[PDB]
Amino acid sequence: TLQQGGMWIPSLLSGMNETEMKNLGMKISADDIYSVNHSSLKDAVPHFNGGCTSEVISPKGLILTNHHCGFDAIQNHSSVDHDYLTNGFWAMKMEDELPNENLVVTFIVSINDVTAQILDGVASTEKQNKIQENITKVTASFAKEAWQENKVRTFFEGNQYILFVTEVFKDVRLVGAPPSLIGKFGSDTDNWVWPRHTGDFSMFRVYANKNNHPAAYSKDNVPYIPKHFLPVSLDGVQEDDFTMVMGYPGKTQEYLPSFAVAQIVNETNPAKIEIREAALKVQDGFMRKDNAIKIQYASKYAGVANYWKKWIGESQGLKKSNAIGLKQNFEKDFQQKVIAAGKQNEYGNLLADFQKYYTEITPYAVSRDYFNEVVVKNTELLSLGYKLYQLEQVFQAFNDRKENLIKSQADFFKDFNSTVDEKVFEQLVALYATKAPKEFLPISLEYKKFAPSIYSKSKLVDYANFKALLSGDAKAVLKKISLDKGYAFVKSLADNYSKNIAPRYDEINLKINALQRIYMKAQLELYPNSRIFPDANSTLRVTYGKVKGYSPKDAIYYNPTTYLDGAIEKYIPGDYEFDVPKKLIDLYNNKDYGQYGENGKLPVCFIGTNHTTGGNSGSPAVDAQGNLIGLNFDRVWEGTMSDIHYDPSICRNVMVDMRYVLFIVDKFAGAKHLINEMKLVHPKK
Amino acid sequence: TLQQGGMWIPSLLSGMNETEMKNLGMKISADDIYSVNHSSLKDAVPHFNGGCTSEVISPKGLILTNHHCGFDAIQNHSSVDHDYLTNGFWAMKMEDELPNENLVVTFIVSINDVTAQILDGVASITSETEKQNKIQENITKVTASFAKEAWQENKVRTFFEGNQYILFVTEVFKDVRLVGAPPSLIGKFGSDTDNWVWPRHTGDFSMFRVYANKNNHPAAYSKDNVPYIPKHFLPVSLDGVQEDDFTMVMGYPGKTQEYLPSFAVAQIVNETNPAKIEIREAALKVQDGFMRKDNAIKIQYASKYAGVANYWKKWIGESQGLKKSNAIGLKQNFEKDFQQKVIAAGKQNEYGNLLADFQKYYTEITPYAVSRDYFNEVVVKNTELLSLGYKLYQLEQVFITKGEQAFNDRKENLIKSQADFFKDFNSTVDEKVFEQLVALYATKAPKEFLPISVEYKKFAPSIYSKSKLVDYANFKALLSGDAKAVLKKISLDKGYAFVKSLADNYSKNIAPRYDEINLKINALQRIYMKAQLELYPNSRIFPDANSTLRVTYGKVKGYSPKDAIYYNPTTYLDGAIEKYIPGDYEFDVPKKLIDLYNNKDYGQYGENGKLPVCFIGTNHTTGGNSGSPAVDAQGNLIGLNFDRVWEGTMSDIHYDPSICRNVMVDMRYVLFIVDKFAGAKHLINEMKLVHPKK
Ligand SMILES: [Cl-]
Numbered sequence A: 001t002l003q004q005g006g007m008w009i010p011s012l013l014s015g016m017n018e019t020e021m022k023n024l025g026m027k028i029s030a031d032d033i034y035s036v037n038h039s040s041l042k043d044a045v046p047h048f049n050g051g052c053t054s055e056v057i058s059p060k061g062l063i064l065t066n067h068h069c070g071f072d073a074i075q076n077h078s079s080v081d082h083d084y085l086t087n088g089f090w091a092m093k094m095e096d097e098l099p100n101e102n103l104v105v106t107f108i109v110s111i112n113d114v115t116a117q118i119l120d121g122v123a124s125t126e127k128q129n130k131i132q133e134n135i136t137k138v139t140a141s142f143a144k145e146a147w148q149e150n151k152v153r154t155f156f157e158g159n160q161y162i163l164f165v166t167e168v169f170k171d172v173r174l175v176g177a178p179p180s181l182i183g184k185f186g187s188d189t190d191n192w193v194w195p196r197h198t199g200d201f202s203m204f205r206v207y208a209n210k211n212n213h214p215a216a217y218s219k220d221n222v223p224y225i226p227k228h229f230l231p232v233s234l235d236g237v238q239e240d241d242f243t244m245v246m247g248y249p250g251k252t253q254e255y256l257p258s259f260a261v262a263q264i265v266n267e268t269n270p271a272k273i274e275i276r277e278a279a280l281k282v283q284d285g286f287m288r289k290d291n292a293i294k295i296q297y298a299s300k301y302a303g304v305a306n307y308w309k310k311w312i313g314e315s316q317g318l319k320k321s322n323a324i325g326l327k328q329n330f331e332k333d334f335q336q337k338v339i340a341a342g343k344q345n346e347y348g349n350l351l352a353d354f355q356k357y358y359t360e361i362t363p364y365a366v367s368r369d370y371f372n373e374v375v376v377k378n379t380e381l382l383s384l385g386y387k388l389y390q391l392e393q394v395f396q397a398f399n400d401r402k403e404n405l406i407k408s409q410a411d412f413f414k415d416f417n418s419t420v421d422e423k424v425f426e427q428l429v430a431l432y433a434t435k436a437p438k439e440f441l442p443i444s445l446e447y448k449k450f451a452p453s454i455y456s457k458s459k460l461v462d463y464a465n466f467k468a469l470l471s472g473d474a475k476a477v478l479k480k481i482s483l484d485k486g487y488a489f490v491k492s493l494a495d496n497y498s499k500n501i502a503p504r505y506d507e508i509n510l511k512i513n514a515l516q517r518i519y520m521k522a523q524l525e526l527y528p529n530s531r532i533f534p535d536a537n538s539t540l541r542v543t544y545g546k547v548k549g550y551s552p553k554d555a556i557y558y559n560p561t562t563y564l565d566g567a568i569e570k571y572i573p574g575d576y577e578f579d580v581p582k583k584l585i586d587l588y589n590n591k592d593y594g595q596y597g598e599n600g601k602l603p604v605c606f607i608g609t610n611h612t613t614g615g616n617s618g619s620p621a622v623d624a625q626g627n628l629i630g631l632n633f634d635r636v637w638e639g640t641m642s643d644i645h646y647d648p649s650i651c652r653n654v655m656v657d658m659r660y661v662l663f664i665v666d667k668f669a670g671a672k673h674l675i676n677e678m679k680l681v682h683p684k685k
Numbered sequence B: 001t002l003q004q005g006g007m008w009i010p011s012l013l014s015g016m017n018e019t020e021m022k023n024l025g026m027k028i029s030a031d032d033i034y035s036v037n038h039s040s041l042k043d044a045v046p047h048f049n050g051g052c053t054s055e056v057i058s059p060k061g062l063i064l065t066n067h068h069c070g071f072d073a074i075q076n077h078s079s080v081d082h083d084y085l086t087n088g089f090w091a092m093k094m095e096d097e098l099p100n101e102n103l104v105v106t107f108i109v110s111i112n113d114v115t116a117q118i119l120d121g122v123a124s125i126t127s128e129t130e131k132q133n134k135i136q137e138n139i140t141k142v143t144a145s146f147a148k149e150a151w152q153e154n155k156v157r158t159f160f161e162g163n164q165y166i167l168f169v170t171e172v173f174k175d176v177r178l179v180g181a182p183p184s185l186i187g188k189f190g191s192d193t194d195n196w197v198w199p200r201h202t203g204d205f206s207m208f209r210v211y212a213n214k215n216n217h218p219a220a221y222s223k224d225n226v227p228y229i230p231k232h233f234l235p236v237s238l239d240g241v242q243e244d245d246f247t248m249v250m251g252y253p254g255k256t257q258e259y260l261p262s263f264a265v266a267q268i269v270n271e272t273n274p275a276k277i278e279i280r281e282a283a284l285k286v287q288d289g290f291m292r293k294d295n296a297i298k299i300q301y302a303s304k305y306a307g308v309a310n311y312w313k314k315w316i317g318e319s320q321g322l323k324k325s326n327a328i329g330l331k332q333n334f335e336k337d338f339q340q341k342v343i344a345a346g347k348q349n350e351y352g353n354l355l356a357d358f359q360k361y362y363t364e365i366t367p368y369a370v371s372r373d374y375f376n377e378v379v380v381k382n383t384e385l386l387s388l389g390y391k392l393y394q395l396e397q398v399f400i401t402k403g404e405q406a407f408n409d410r411k412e413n414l415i416k417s418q419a420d421f422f423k424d425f426n427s428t429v430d431e432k433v434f435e436q437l438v439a440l441y442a443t444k445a446p447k448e449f450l451p452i453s454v455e456y457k458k459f460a461p462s463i464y465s466k467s468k469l470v471d472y473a474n475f476k477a478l479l480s481g482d483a484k485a486v487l488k489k490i491s492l493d494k495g496y497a498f499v500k501s502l503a504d505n506y507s508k509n510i511a512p513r514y515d516e517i518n519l520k521i522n523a524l525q526r527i528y529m530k531a532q533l534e535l536y537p538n539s540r541i542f543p544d545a546n547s548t549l550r551v552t553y554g555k556v557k558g559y560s561p562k563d564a565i566y567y568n569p570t571t572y573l574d575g576a577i578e579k580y581i582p583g584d585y586e587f588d589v590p591k592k593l594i595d596l597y598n599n600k601d602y603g604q605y606g607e608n609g610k611l612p613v614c615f616i617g618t619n620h621t622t623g624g625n626s627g628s629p630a631v632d633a634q635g636n637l638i639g640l641n642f643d644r645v646w647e648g649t650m651s652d653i654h655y656d657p658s659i660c661r662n663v664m665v666d667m668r669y670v671l672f673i674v675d676k677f678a679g680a681k682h683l684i685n686e687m688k689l690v691h692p693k694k
């Protein structure tokens, strides 16, 4: 099987990769994309807060990312006096830019293979305890500048180790954000959806000291001067235009065996899917009644239904595409290739071992994320009580330090209905008793009660009385904590998982990981020239493709670009999701599009055949000349499976049209000074 | 203001129409479509029971129409032991074909203008309504007089709101038997979810056979009747359809109103449609519940539910498309140019004022029209007990008007016709829908014409107690005896008593005024029509549909419902599979079809390993065009018309060519279902299969 898609290490583009790109239309070289010697594209593409991507678009450190990447910083700086979430935020001067605590932006200096130094493991199961040894060893040892940091990452399930030389800037200030109605237009409804019309962006500026080096916040740090910044094209995109996406994809698992994928589609995914669906249908029941609750639980209904949607997407995608079956055809060929290579002694039993360990780990795996999806994350009291549980066996200083931070849960009791909570505890704990593997169930077996009884006695329903339970010396507060029926029920299930499930889940998990690394090694050996790329691991990658529409269903085709016309079609006055700010509607009605327009219409978004995943939020999409044309912010629904199985016919990434970005910055915000700071170019003639 | 779309009188195709068709790729001619000298297409396209279209596809009377046109006939011979609704039905030889009482199929012999004869003496010698009164005498006068054969019938129809009158000589066949139908899961795949929706994957068809006496002439049913031999039948193409293929649809579109004033559209959108929508929604919700929980109740209500449901959803789409497209403003803009053209023609005395008068009367009639809608929807159509009661109400005034013998004639005829009414009547169902609809009439109807409602009816559930309208044996006893007594027996029944309070409240306090104003609006509409005909002579003006034979043409063409979204013009069986939901009410698939799909056993009906199912084109259709043939450039059958797409559900009021499409079953899928699925190859051997693209 020839692998489709690809998330490529930016330093290994020569050969196959560059040939594909130039045949896809790329004009620049591999050298322009990465180099240790001179300024390349990678110098304009930093890691954003360890979980997202951003890109430099001016020589004064102006960076662009998604609105939902900068959401937390924006929300942190907003209140009912200065409601930036709603109104947007724009710094007219650089001194008006708002500092952000715990926001870092990381640049890659150099990408360095250190697999040899890390691997003194084999010829000895008790020493990947040695490569942890060797990693720490080589980390301090590798050639680094004083103001730089070394990071060793595991590639290919542990067959390759690469050290990154990085610079971690710790002074990143909010420069600009559109109003939420623009930045998350269509919120939940349009999540994972194409056609999409969302101006999902926000801007920050990277600050440094007088030596243009990484530094903590100082009141007289200066704007960072990049080694490279991306010029912004005004010419727009067309179907079949070459696109390149550079970013920090978090995690893929493209080389899983069929048994793993079967466990996803037939057991683990359906398990979690029903759980969040329960929490959701019952949340939407009260949100359909009161509007003060609707504004309350909207951000949280969002956060949970997001993954609810992704998993449905993944299951349907995998079912529709027959991934399990394609995996099986591969495994029939794999076995043959092993046999013909004379490598049965190394690889001969890989598939048979997989099946037995995967068959066996199933009840643990399902029980595990029933605990997770009911206790740890979705039932907000059990999640509160669980947070309390994990500070219990920090064992006094470490306990109290953790507890001063745990008392600061002001913002969640604020806008929390325990009337609502009582609903989710009922439905979700019911599911756990009547659906979870009965052999690992604890204090179930029948207690349909202790439902409003727990929200009627727990010192965890309001915050002031929550403080009153955590009051007391280092001790007795524990005695007070186990007094609570709420915590006693969280403890109960947590003790059970931690002794009856975790001890043996983790064991089989290591057996399977060991198998997988041999499997990956076997595939790389037996299938050269089949476009095998390392699974994502939050490191800088390059992917490429083209502007291309797709078909989601029989007789339905989606074109690859949207327009403001399409947003006005979705416009609903006063709607929480589809309202449109007055100036934008004014701007539409007068077609006041400036240099951003295209024949009396304004481009908004477009989609591409680039292979992205979570972590690629805010990633730059450049054209063949290396100019910014788009801003990545999502994947289409039909290809949310792309971590397990990439299908080039329906996998698409969704990007904001940069013409739309600048339009919003300019004609909407009136922040033209941010644009004069940019390089506006015309690559098409 | 050049009028888009169109539904043309088939004898008038020469000139503008024919040029347009040949330009689209038509190879045949006007004389091939309609002729009195020799056979033509019209001979192969009869009216199917006066509400749908059908087409002859064999020289032994085999006709093809929609599954929902055959539906009432299918439901009528279905039961628990023989559920043809669910299982389909297939006459393996001609004697197994099922006779249908009260099913006729009408062929058009000739199309004859008789305007002069009809408007003879109505010039101004009268009083608008006794003008209509004189019109009806000329109509009856010509119908009796016009030359026809003995076995034929005349029917005079009104065109252009009364500016033109055309007589149709016809042959009405009365022995039409059921030959074939697919299971409902193929016949209405997707049911109400997919109704009025593209993409569509529905095999919407059924087959009948026309029978005649030994002179190849119309005959009431008889075991000695033989297959009718037609003057022409449509060969069926196996070479399929590609985008831009010329298509022509011939059929009997029921009603269209392309030439309404602004104020008519506003009344539709703002008050008539929302009322009727809300009323039908409550009725259907109640009915859906009982039918998803009981097949026997589903066999009872299948036909009655589908009829109601179809317009309920149509009206949602129609109101949606009229608003979205701003038809009201579009016409306002036309009307500001209309009168600018009545002054340019020096005709302000006949016209001009029209638009002002319309606004006057349309505003005035508003609360009556609404209150009327509530009465028709709640008493006449959706609540079956009130429905039967209201017929007794009318039969009451036959006695008063036409006499005791007329009473007992129409009473005994009413009783024999209530047979199948009670076969399909479920007391439990009708009372729950009664409880919901009477609530709506009281609370949401205009209060200044409300009847006994005094202000709260509370719940009178058991008026189904011992109203004798609930049961057939009951109903007969109520009407047993002489003309009086029976009339007082009826007056005592708690059911009919209730309907009486609503009925004479309507007939005395709403109906008189509504009629008065509507007559004025209609008359004004007649003149408005003539005005537009004069001041816009070469603007492709076609007569509104009026359930007469029309031709429309265009091409296989997709469309774009929304930004970045394109709908392709053809669907395939794998698209049906994508929608498959095991054991689902609407989207379950039969077992045999799933096997055929998995085997890709398509035979000569397949196209590179795929099975076409439906397609769409720019033909202008409306209700009545159900079952119309779509023919290619050479006059071969390539599709079977059966719906319109969501975006064009407005097309009776406003036609927009970029989004109005008709939906057709691909004839390759029809034959596939007849053949591979049912094993009814013998019906195929009857047809002439051709290859026009070879
Ligand atoms: Cl423009």
Ligand SMILES: [Cl-]
Pocket (backbone or CB within 6 Å): A612, A613, A614, A615, A616, A617, A633, A634, A635, A653
């Ligand atoms: Cl993504």
Ligand code: NA
Pocket (backbone or CB within 6 Å): A239, A547, A548, A549, A550, A558, A559, A560
């Ligand atoms: Na495309």
